[PDB]
Paper text:
For the DotBL structure, two identical hexamers could be built, on top of each other, while only one is present in DotBY. The hinge point of this rotation is within the proline‐rich linker. In the hexamer, subunits A, C, and E adopt the α conformation, and subunits B, D, and F the β conformation, yielding an overall threefold symmetry [Fig. 2(C)]. DotBL was crystallized in the presence of AMP–PNP and ATPase activity assays using DotBL preincubated with increasing concentrations of AMP‐PNP show that the analogue binds and competes with ATP resulting in an inhibition of phosphate release. Yet, we could observe density for only phosphate not AMP–PNP. The phosphate is clamped by the main chain NH groups between residues 158 and 163 (TGSGKS) and by the Lys162 side chain. In the vicinity of this binding site (less than 6 Å away), the side chains of Glu191 (Asp box), Glu235 (Walker B) and His260 (His box), together with Arg221 (in α6) from the next subunit, point towards the ligand. In the α‐subunits, the binding site is highly similar, except for n + 1 Arg221, which is further from the binding site due to the alternate conformation of the n + 1 subunit [Fig. 4(D)]. Overall, we concluded that disruption of this interface by mutating those two arginines leads to disruption of the hexamer.
Residue numbers in the entry:
A (entry chain D): 6 to 373
B (entry chain C): 5 to 373
C (entry chain B): 4 to 374
Write the structure that this text describes.
């Protein structure tokens, strides 16, 4: 609990950096700025006011425009949302990073803006911390094809991918041009400074219209690794399929829960006439699928369960030579024989005592 | 790990970029990547090497791109747009260097920034003798009719290969060949080759004719002796080319499938059940030759071409036509084993000859199974 | 020396000198003449390709030629990324007349956009029907009072020709009071030479004269034809237009890219969305009169021969098809080809015993169709 050392009479972007310094000195996870209200910081679950002035819609608009460009205000007034990234160096020391989100709300009967900065770590966690089977590590760096991390949002998939990239990039003799396309650019790799790799990070609302546009653009840049934050629609899926067929590792995430179910989503994304071709493409290209789920622990902290299949040459052949109409079933069997089920990982964790009995039984019930 | 340019400026200016480029070519770079907050990189033989020790500034890069494209280029990047263009320049020698350039906006250290990428554009088809090709391929490379597939990953030099084939069929006297090629982006041209009795028409598919398939269908209207289709991805183009071959025209195409048997599987599966059997017979009858090509590092730190090929003799084709169509893939495997040449076999031969590294050999063996 | 130079080669090539050069090429018995930017004019005589000029033509010359053949805006059309197909006739000093299919396509020469034109010689007159070697069934079925006749098959199966022959038969005979309207896109066959009494033939080219094949048919409905020729019916639009024309009571003749009578049926029925498609299907069944799928297969003589699988849609066939379940029309049709029609395989067999096709080829046909 503190107050800002030198609050300005009016808040200008220059002062926002100082305010952020103050918040970090307090160890704030999050900083919330709203028009009708003082600046708030959340330290350790408690919300504290870090300024004794209520800001103004003009001030907030200025802040957001500085952070995300001249048209940010107009974008908010159009009825859109802003997600971006903000970073600063206080004085040639360490650097401060943030995921920033501006949204329109209604304050005192008038349109206004609310901007939220969430502290994001500087470097992706190492892969060893992720606690991954050896199978996955062997499957994690294919020459070509698609790697999918699936699960409901807040499963920490972005973190995982970020980590893989770090691993793939940091090592010597990894001559990899990496191109990522991210809605919000969660992670940066400037600190890692690998010997023979480059990472170019393009933010989708700011730098390039679309995720699909992004990938198709990557095809023109001769990357060795392509990161697409999400592939929700069939355009992005098709772009990524071309990139993979072209011969480039593609890494993406999906909202689907379950490797077989994931397959079903991929195949159905396309109309009937396209769907057979599209399916052959997908089966050919896929290399690895992981569905991650964050579940509460006995310690009241979160743990990652994971159901994965590695799509070996053998698996891929099985799927391609078989009747396509039932890929979904086939994959379901294959995860059982060559992969790892969500229920199985849940049981392992339960025997380890990491998860509660009730949670385990829940997972078993859902998987049924 | 890092081969530096000779005369590195304090701040990088378009004049120097030209100098920087010649150097990269001297190193035999395919691609040059310039990014803010990073040194200039060149890809030589799949390895990335830094061409300078100095990290370029955003302003420098903006200047470069403005020079290559236009004054408004930086703004356009600020727009949230992508730049694709080309850059040519005339060295000391005068014979020009040219590149496909692409500038895209990214975020570097919290600030908007630019990345430019320059990709070398080959011009002149190799000679076929330089390709190092078995004789049984050379005998089979000029069928009267049917389809010749060069398959492999992008950047395996299949474009170069078929360019070389075309050169060979064009430059020989008494080769009365009207050649029509349809390619995504035209890379190889045949104006420099002198011909006595051949014509080559090159149509670019985004610019000149909407589809590859359209392109082929157009070729039929042009009545040439040889048809080149850059890629044959979907069942449309495959069907077009099947009609072209059934009519009586050599068709040459590429696929991204890895393996003769696998390529077969892709071709056959392209088609739904009711069309599927007919289409399959068509394919089997029309096929004349399949080469899957793979570029693999050598002892002297360069690259070499391994090839797994089958020549589809009349006998082979009969074998395939007699059999169960669902067993077409397997039968094809057997046929590459008996009458063709496997990727693994080529890898072994190269290893015994000392061209490929032991490690590399092992790696190759791993993949095929 | 594989060069046969043009008698009076101009300093720059202009359309008239194109006519003269064409004369020269005919004198050499050239099948095809290809003109390209940055290249001399070539003519193909039999196997051989021979340059007819020492000068390589400039892009502007070519553009002028094509504009002369196909309208001021031909160049711009090429630059759009489109492809030009048309037809070019010219009359020597002789009363005789020269006809070609012309095709112009855009290509890249020396790094610049350029043009390639190709003229392929066309005969003056459709073959006779008797030359076509058609069963008597088909000849009886070839001139219905109303309904649709489909000639289907892959490109290069000579369906266009066969159509031209039918039309020639129907216009040549006396007391055949037929106004014939064709919508051919590239017009390949002309009927000027036949010039018979009691028939008129109006041939409209689809790129040049009328936007679309469907537009073309709908236009024919306004002209009181007795016979309508549509080059192709890919669209549901064109199919619907032709269905209206047939329902009104006009013979319609078209081609399809599909292989097999049953398959052709499948395509026709599937063209239409679900709410429309049952009605659509009744219409189709009622209207159809004849389906011929044609395939050109090599002969022992190293020429080609035409195999045909046809069904004639008699009143009774049509009844069978209408009375049964709409959704399985394709299968019922499949059986009806077997029972009342003629299969590709059977024709292949008859040809083989006759010794027209080789064992291998016939063997192949059995393999594909049998499926």
């Amino acid at each position: 609990i503190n107050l800002m050392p030198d609050e300005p009479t009016r808040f200008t972007p220059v002062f926002m950096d100082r305010m952020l310094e103050h918040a970090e000195s307090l160890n704030a996870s999050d900083i919330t700025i709203q028009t009708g209200e003082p600046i708030f910081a959340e330290v350790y679950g408690r919300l504290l006011k870090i300024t004794n002035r209520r800001l103004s819609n003009t001030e907030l608009g200025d802040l957001i425009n500085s952070i995300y460009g001249p048209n940010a205000t107009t974008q908010l007034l159009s009825g859109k949302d802003i997600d971006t990234h903000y970073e600063f160096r206080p004085n040639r020391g360490v650097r401060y990073r943030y995921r920033v989100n501006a949204t329109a709300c209604l304050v005192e009967g008038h349109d206004a803006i609310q901007i939220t900065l969430r502290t994001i770590p500087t470097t992706p966690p190492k892969l060893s911390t992720m606690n991954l089977p050896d199978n996955i590590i062997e499957a994690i760096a294919p020459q070509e094809g698609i790697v999918f991390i699936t699960g409901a949002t807040g499963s920490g998939k972005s973190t995982l991918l970020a980590s893989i990239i770090r691993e793939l990039i940091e090592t010597s003799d990894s001559n990899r041009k990496v191109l990522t396309y991210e809605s919000p650019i969660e992670f940066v790799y400037d600190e890692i400074e690998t010997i023979s790799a480059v990472v170019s990070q393009s933010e989708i609302p700011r730098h390039l219209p679309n995720f699909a546009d992004g990938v198709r653009n990557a095809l023109r840049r001769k990357p060795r690794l392509i990161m697409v934050g999400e592939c929700r629609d069939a355009e992005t899926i098709s772009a990524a399929l071309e990139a993979a067929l072209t011969g480039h590792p593609v890494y993406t995430t999906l909202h689907t829960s379950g490797v077989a179910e994931t397959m079903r989503r991929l195949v159905t994304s396309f109309s009937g006439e396209e769907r057979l071709g599209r399916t052959i493409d997908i089966l050919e290209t896929i290399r690895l699928c992981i569905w991650q789920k964050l579940v509460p622990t006995v310690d009241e902290r979160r743990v990652a369960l994971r159901e994965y299949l590695v799509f070996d040459e053998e698996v891929r052949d099985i799927l391609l030579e078989g009747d396509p109409n039932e890929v979904t079933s086939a994959t379901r069997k294959l995860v059982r024989q060559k992969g790892q089920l969500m229920t199985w990982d849940a049981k392992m964790k339960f025997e380890q005592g990491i998860i509660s009995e009730r949670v385990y039984k829940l997972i078993i019930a859902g998987a049924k």
